[PDB]
Amino acid sequence: AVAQQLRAESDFEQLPDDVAISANIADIEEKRGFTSHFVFVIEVKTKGGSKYLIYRRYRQFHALQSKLEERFGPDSKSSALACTLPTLPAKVYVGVKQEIAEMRIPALNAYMKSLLSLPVWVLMDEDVRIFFYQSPYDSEQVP
Ligand SMILES: CCCC(=O)OC[C@@H](COP(=O)(O)O[C@@H]1[C@H](O)[C@H](OP(=O)(O)O)[C@@H](O)[C@H](O)[C@H]1O)OC(=O)CCC
C-alpha cells in the first residue's frame, strides 16, 4: 500500500498553502436584539501554518451545505463529481436558542472535520474556500 501513501503525499503537495486543514469551535457568542441569534467562533489552521478566527452563524452553514448537495449530492445531475458528503446537523424550528447552540458545538465540529477530508474538487470549490477564509469583519477583530 506504499503506492497509496506516495500518491496521497503528491496530491497534498499540490494544494495551495492557504487551504484549511482543521477547524474547531472555540466559543459561542449571543447577538441580542428584538430577535437574538448565536454565532460560532471557529479557529482555522491552514496547510501553510496560519492560525486565525472566523465567525459564522448556523444559517450560513446551512446555505453552504445546500450548495454542496446541489453540486455533489445524490440529486446532483453531474454524476462525475458525486461523492459522500457529511450530513449537517438539522434545523430546529423552536426551542431555547442558547441550548440549541451548545448542543451544536460537537455536532458542527464533526461536520467540519468530515468536510475538510473530502476530495480535492470539493475542497477547492469556491464557496467552500470562501466559507473558511477570513472576511474583512473576521480579520478586523482582536482575538
Ligand atoms: C409555512 C411555514 C414554514 C416555516 O416555518 O418555514 C421556516 C423556514 C425554516 O427557518 P430557517 O430560518 O430557514 O431556519 C433556521 C435557521 O437556519 C437558524 O439559523 P441561525 O441560528 O443562524 O439564525 C437555525 O438556528 C434554526 O434552527 C433554523 O430553523 O423554512 C424555510 O426557510 C423554507 C421555506 C418554507
| CB 12 within 8 Å of CB 4 | no
Sign of CA dihedral 47, 53, 58, 59: negative
CATH number at residue 98: 3.30.1520.10
Q: Is 36 helix (H, G, I), strand (E, B) or coil?
A: coil
Residue 18's Cα: distance from chain center in Å? 15
Cα–Cα distance for residue pair 76/28, rounded to 1 Å: 33
- From the CB of 59, is ligand 1 less than 6 Å away? yes
Top mutation candidate among 31, 41, 58 for ligand 1, by most atoms within 8 Å of CB: 58
* 58 marked ligand binding residue: yes
- Please state the domain count of the chain: 1
Q: Comparing C-alpha atoms, which of 118, 125, 112 is closest to residue 56?
A: 112
| CB 29 within 8 Å of CB 38 | yes
Task: Say how many Å lie between the CA of residue 28 and the centre of ligand 1.
Answer: 20
Query: Range of 2's domain?
Result: 1-143
CA distances to 23, 36, 121 from 42, in Å? 6, 20, 23
* 59 marked ligand binding residue: yes
In this structure, which residue's CA is closest to atom 13 in ligand 1?
59
* Beta-carbon contacts of residue 113 (< 8 Å; ≥ 6 apart): 22, 23
Q: Where are the alpha helices (DSSP H) in 1-143?
A: 2-14, 58-72, 97-115, 120-123, 126-132, 136-139
Cα–Cα distance for residue pair 62/92, rounded to 1 Å: 12
Sign of CA dihedral 61, 65, 116, 126: negative
Q: Which DSSP letter does residue 80 get?
A: G
Q: Is 50 helix (H, G, I), strand (E, B) or coil?
A: coil
Cell of residue 94, nine digits:
423552536
Q: Comparing C-alpha atoms, which of 125, 26, 9 is closest to residue 68?
A: 125
* Beta-carbon contacts of residue 57 (< 8 Å; ≥ 6 apart): 37, 38, 39, 40
Write down the residue that cell numbers 470562501 correspond to.
130
| CB 58 within 8 Å of CB 104 | yes
Residue 74's Cα: distance from chain center in Å? 20
- From the CB of 93, is ligand 1 less than 6 Å away? yes
